[PDB]
């Protein structure tokens, strides 16, 4: 179980960063949970998460800083409203819930950079 995502991303002057998280799957994973973590100065914390039912869109949790769209086995995650304080490594964790067997994957993480006008 390996999940890939961009190594580094530049947030536009508006403050909009986007990255895809595509994951390896045995095949036909009806339910999948995507979970984005922010690695700050030596600490990791969940900033957003969402379940992914096959044949339809995502369903993020309220107050999630992310919004995304599905496409087979990959989600196109975009986060808005960023400034220099939010610059860090955004790791995405993906796990196959149903049907079993259960798998768990964590990527290297997308290092999002931001600077304020």
């Amino acid at each position: 179980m390996h999940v890939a995502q961009p190594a580094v991303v530049l947030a536009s002057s508006r403050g909009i960063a986007s990255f895809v998280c595509e994951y390896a799957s045995p095949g036909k994973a009806t339910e999948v949970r995507v979970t984005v973590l922010r690695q700050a100065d030596s600490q990791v914390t969940e900033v957003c998460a969402a379940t992914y039912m096959m044949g339809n869109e995502l369903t993020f949790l309220d107050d999630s800083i992310c919004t995304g769209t599905s496409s087979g086995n990959q989600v196109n995650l975009t986060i808005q409203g960023l400034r220099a304080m939010d610059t860090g490594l955004y790791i995405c964790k993906v796990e196959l819930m149903y049907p079993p067997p259960y798998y768990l994957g964590i990527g290297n993480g997308t290092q999002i950079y931001v600077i304020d006008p």
């Binding site: 179980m1 390996h2 796990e95 067997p101 259960y102 798998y103 768990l104 994957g105 964590i106």
Partner: peptide, 14 residues
């Protein structure tokens, strides 16, 4: 018995 395994950050590798 078919059992999964923790290997590094990932889990699975049955």
């Amino acid at each position: 018995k078919t059992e999964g395994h923790y290997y590094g950050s990932n889990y699975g590798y049955y």
